Amino acid sequence: MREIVHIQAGQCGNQIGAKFWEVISDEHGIDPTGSYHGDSDLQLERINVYYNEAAGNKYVPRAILVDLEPGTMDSVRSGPFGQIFRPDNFVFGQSGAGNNWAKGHYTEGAELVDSVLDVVRKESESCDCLQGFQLTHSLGGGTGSGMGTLLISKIREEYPDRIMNTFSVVPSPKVSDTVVEPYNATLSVHQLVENTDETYCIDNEALYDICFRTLKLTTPTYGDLNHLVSATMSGVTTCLRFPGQLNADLRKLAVNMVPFPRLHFFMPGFAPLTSRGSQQYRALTVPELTQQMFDAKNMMAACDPRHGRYLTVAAVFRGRMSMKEVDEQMLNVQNKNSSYFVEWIPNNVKTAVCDIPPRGLKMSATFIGNSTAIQELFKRISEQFTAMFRRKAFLHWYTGEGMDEMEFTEAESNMNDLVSEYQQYQ
Amino acid sequence: MRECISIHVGQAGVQIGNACWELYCLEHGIQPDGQMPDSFNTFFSETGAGKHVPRAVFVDLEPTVIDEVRTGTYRQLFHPEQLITGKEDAANNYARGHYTIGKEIIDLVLDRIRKLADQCTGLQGFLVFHSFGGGTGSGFTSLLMERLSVDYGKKSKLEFSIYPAPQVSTAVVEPYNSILTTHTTLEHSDCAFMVDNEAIYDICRRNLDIERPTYTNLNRLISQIVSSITASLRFDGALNVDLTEFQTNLVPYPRIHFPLATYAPVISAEKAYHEQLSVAEITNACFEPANQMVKCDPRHGKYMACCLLYRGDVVPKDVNAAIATIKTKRSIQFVDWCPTGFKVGINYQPPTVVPGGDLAKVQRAVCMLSNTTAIAEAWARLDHKFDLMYAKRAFVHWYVGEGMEEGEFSEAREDMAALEKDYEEVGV
Amino acid sequence: NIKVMCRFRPLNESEVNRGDKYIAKFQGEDTVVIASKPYAFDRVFQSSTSQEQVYNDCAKKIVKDVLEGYNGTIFAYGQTSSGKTHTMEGKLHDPEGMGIIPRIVQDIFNYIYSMDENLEFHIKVSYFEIYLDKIRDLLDVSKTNLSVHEDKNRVPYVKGCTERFVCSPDEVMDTIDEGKSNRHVAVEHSSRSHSIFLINVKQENTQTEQKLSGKLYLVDLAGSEKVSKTGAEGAVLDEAKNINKSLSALGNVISALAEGSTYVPYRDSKMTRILQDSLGGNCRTTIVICCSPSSYNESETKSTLLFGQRAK
Ligand SMILES: CC(=O)O[C@H]1C(=O)[C@@]2(C)[C@H]([C@H](OC(=O)c3ccccc3)[C@]3(O)C[C@H](OC(=O)[C@H](O)[C@@H](NC(=O)c4ccccc4)c4ccccc4)C(C)=C1C3(C)C)[C@]1(OC(C)=O)CO[C@@H]1C[C@@H]2O
Ligand SMILES: Nc1nc2c(ncn2[C@@H]2O[C@H](COP(=O)(O)OP(=O)(O)OP(=O)(O)O)[C@@H](O)[C@H]2O)c(=O)[nH]1
Ligand SMILES: Nc1nc2c(ncn2[C@@H]2O[C@H](COP(=O)(O)OP(=O)(O)O)[C@@H](O)[C@H]2O)c(=O)[nH]1
Ligand SMILES: Nc1ncnc2c1ncn2[C@@H]1O[C@H](COP(=O)(O)OP(=O)(O)O)[C@@H](O)[C@H]1O
Ligand SMILES: [Mg+2]
């Protein structure tokens, strides 16, 4: 009943997915061995969305882990929750992508994508009613970008009437670890804009900013970043497995949030976020969640919504709360900030309410937004791309695998057309 | 005999039905298991072992809310085949609920209704609860109404709907669904009651003194209104009026069939004392512009007809005095072609209180249903919203990818314009 | 600039026995009144109109312009049994019954047979269809999933399509017949895929060393279907969904072009992407919508007229 198949590609995707599965298993009361040690029936009521049953009351995730190197695989396998995954769903090669989009999209990923498609097809035929697919990856690397793009294309060709939502970590301006990041990011967006239904944009800079400022953490590591991302991933699909006063599914959020087919790039957010030693001084009410959600310094994308207008906003609430308060807050947010919302669309906000809060909290909320301010991200990527492409720098690592310069020019033109599309409604 | 069939389609309909059936069970002394330790035949049928099964059908394209009904405290009350559920919902799309996902459980609900209608001798009408602006509640209701009109035809159909509010809204694509469904509800319905949530929030805040209401209070109020409508069929009293009398005294012309409901007194326990709460005081409160369950002041319009329903300890002399006082006032306008504009009904059964509720134990209550020319303001607001969104043709690609042409939008907008011009021309 | 013409047809004998009534009322030469609702176009023909007048008022200027190195596009929209094939094919050999395509090829070759001897001509012909959002070649059934790419001057083109040379009108008619043999057609003769025909006329002067290139597009669109009134199940429903979405996308592009919008959404469909060069800019495009005046076909006529009005 509305099952979700999960795919993790590359190092970033695999680590985010491991954190996500730990969080989801904690929410559903599942031990690392796959056993159930919960305290409520609602935990097991809709466990078929994310888990597959086994003999003797054991649950195996519907996840497929794919990489071109075994190091992340055997780092994930030996972790706290590595014993929960099916050993047959680990698909890996031996020669890595080498931070090359062309390699992972054409040469090494082509010889590995048949196995991934086979395991996906086996997993998807065991579903009573499929709802969509999830992919976690990074645009700036080689295996993530190219291989996930190829997988998305193949899956969209096979199943054209299903949701495809991706949580893609986007290259950041002030934080960088690769020299050939712009090439990969451009060549990846050129395909995401065509073969995806809704893509969530995340960058490490905003996550670092949240950790340093809101959480007051001293030395943040990748665990905290992956933890924030996992929290938002869990919050997106809370209405598929718990009851509530208003129910919103994936297709509902796509219908309400996407006015035109190209415009499906979102910036996520979460609330509440406080620091240890500062939760006793704060009251947790619906106004506080609303105030924190629409704050510029809480989005997980390194874009300022004040430099643009919202086309649509989706707010998903968890806990026990009044509908009058939610409606009033979502109306006064628009009334007070009329200069940040598109005029010809009335009621830019959609509300969903679920009645089971996250463990250890009384209330929570997730924020999905579609703003024209996302065009500055693509502008920076395009600027770097054009700067590096005039000299044809680092271009023989790509033309040595079976690529062409015309592909680069087409990707650049597609990105420019997307930017011009978004700029119209500003 | 006198029996009704209730349909609750969509999440809003199912929740309203939960409230309604809890209320009916408390009224008739029926435990949640169908055993009571002849005034219930309109809403219940005996099975021969003492069990009572409601004449209800619950429908939704999503397996969530009906599942809460299936494992709740009323799980042994409903026939397991009356609760019908699908696989995937309409996703706020009229077309999905109309054809693509509609043409999969429509035959099943039709078969269930045919089974229910064959087990009742004197069918009186249908009571359909749904929501404008949703996917299922707007699309699946259109298909269901079309087939029922084809099949039964002569039986009456009364619709209880949730209309979009002027300011408060939940979805982004509500105007499209509302326009299409209000084009569908003109031809097939016989009497339509529209209530918006913002007015009920205002009523809850001002009268009952609850600052943070939820959907349960709204559903309790709506259930009270429906029970006041059906009291005449269920119980006995002086001047009992049934469905056909309401229709013949409330609908002047075939298309002018969109009344506004009101209830009185909605008072709290603390303020229940300190007040006389007489017949005249209750009647006067039903014409105030702040007690209306739609966002429309009747002072910007003219009344055509109103039917007043009294339950409890009421005497006809007091009703006549109250009618005379109302007729004396100047702020209340009646059309020149309806010199007598009142229909009076009295029932001896006082309202029932539900444990864990906000309404107080009163000794008498009224429920006025009136069709005015002031119901055209909300339609105008919704049309403005629709045309603003449709000028850019936003979200239209979702609707045409499910097999819907682009001319349906223009046709429905034209139908709404024609209806508005009628309510304006009949007003003068 | 965009010109929209509407051509009606006389009631046939097979429907004169049913007592069907004419519904169309003509005002002047640019409006038609159906159900007391005006519908304004650039020119509205009547049943007495001849084929030659349609050619002279719809496609002569485009044919002359293409010969001067420019581009042009001609659409054709209609429901089944509405006059589409008669207006854009007609009798293939009757001098008084030929439609638009044979007249175009006749004029294009009469130009060649009368232009000195220092000019060299080559005619390239392509023919492909769009079925279920997939480009397919009608001259070679092996290719079925072609793609759209760009050149250096960002002028889109279809990669791998068959392009064959022709030297006489007979060859063009033969290739048209061969292409129509492989078009997806429902069970009377209803089309379920869009069809595009390219005639590339390139001339090179040997003396002045000047080259001119012109492309002419002839699009035969499929008609929108109201699924609720038909009962589509299976592949028919998928075809109906795809057709409706594509037609709406084309309407959006044409409206954006006519209203002078800064951004034109050429990339929201396969078809509009292909015709990026031949739709905007200094190109002449006309739309011919064909309807029927029978009372039995009021709704389909209304839909066709509404689609034509969407252009404006
Ligand atoms: C005493 C008390 O109330 O402690 C809170 C707490 O102090 C705060 C600061 C928590 C705390 O979170 C963090 O410090 C944190 C660390 C890394 C990354 C992200 C956050 C908390 O650790 C996190 C924890 O969150 C949960 O329990 C949620 O269910 C959360 N769980 C996990 O992320 C998780 C962690 C480890 C193992 C398994 C799951 C969740 C959120 C969304 C979706 C699913 C689950 C909570 C409320 C607390 C502590 C313990 C201090 C905060 O986080 C969350 C996710 O609730 C940080 O800002 C919020 C506000 C909370 O009040
Ligand atoms: N009174 C009341 N109104 C509700 C309730 N739930 C939703 N609504 C209203 O209904 C509208 C949303 O439509 P829904 O009924 O939830 O949608 P649906 O009919 O289930 O259709 P889909 O979910 O899209 O398949 C909004 O205007 C809500 O305010 C409820 O429980 N009580
Ligand atoms: N949040 C998070 N980001 C990561 C992690 N590892 C790498 N990244 C980011 O991912 C990008 C590098 O791509 P990477 O996945 O390592 O290359 P790949 O292994 O070839 O796919 C850089 O922007 C890194 O900051 C991780 O564990 N967590
Ligand atoms: N304008 C017209 N004048 C006279 N006859 C016409 C006209 N349009 C169509 N017809 C007649 O209609 C017949 C079939 O039309 P057809 O081209 O098959 O339409 P469609 O292709 O839409 O089914 C032709 O034999 C032709 O004689
Ligand atoms: Mg629902």
Author numbering:
A (entry chain B): 1 to 44, 47 to 360, 369 to 436
B (entry chain A): 1 to 37, 47 to 437
C (entry chain K): 8 to 194, 199 to 323
What did the published study say regarding this structure?
Kinesin-1 (also known as conventional kinesin) is an essential ATP-driven molecular motor of the kinesin superfamily capable of processive movement as stepping dimers toward the (+)-end of polarized microtubules (MTs). To limit wasteful ATP hydrolysis and futile runs, cargo-less Kif5 adopts a compacted autoinhibited conformation that involves an interaction between the motor domain and the unstructured C-terminal tail centered on its IAK (isoleucine-alanine-lysine) SLiM31 (hereafter just IAK motif).
To specifically address the effects of the IAK motif in an identical background, we also generated an IAK-variant chimera in which we replaced residues 919-QIAKPIR-925 with an unrelated amino acid sequence (TGSTSGT) that was predicted to abrogate motor-tail interactions. We refer to this variant as Kif5bMoNeXXX. Currently, there is no atomistic model of the MT-bound kinesin-1 motor in the ADP state. Thus, our ~2.9 Å resolution ADP-Kif5bMoNeXXX structure fills an important gap in knowledge. For this chimera, which lacks the endogenous IAK motif, only one-headed MT-bound motors were observed that are devoid, as designed, of the extra density for the tail at its binding location. Noticeably, whilst ADP is present in its binding pocket, density for Mg2+ is absent, despite its clear presence at the N-site of α-tubulin. Yet, while Mg2+ density is absent, ADP is clearly present, indicating that MT binding drastically reduces motor affinity for the ion, but has, together with Mg2+ release, a comparatively less pronounced effect on ADP. Overall, considering the apo-like conformation of our MT-bound and ADP-bound Kif5bMoNeXXX structure, we believe to have captured kinesin-1 in the pre-ADP release ‘strong’ MT-binding state, induced by Mg2+ dissociation. Our structure of ADP-loaded Kif5b bound to its MT track captured the ‘strong’ MT-bound state of the motor after Mg2+ dissociation and before ADP release, allowing us to describe a structural model for the two-step mechanism of MT-stimulated ADP release.
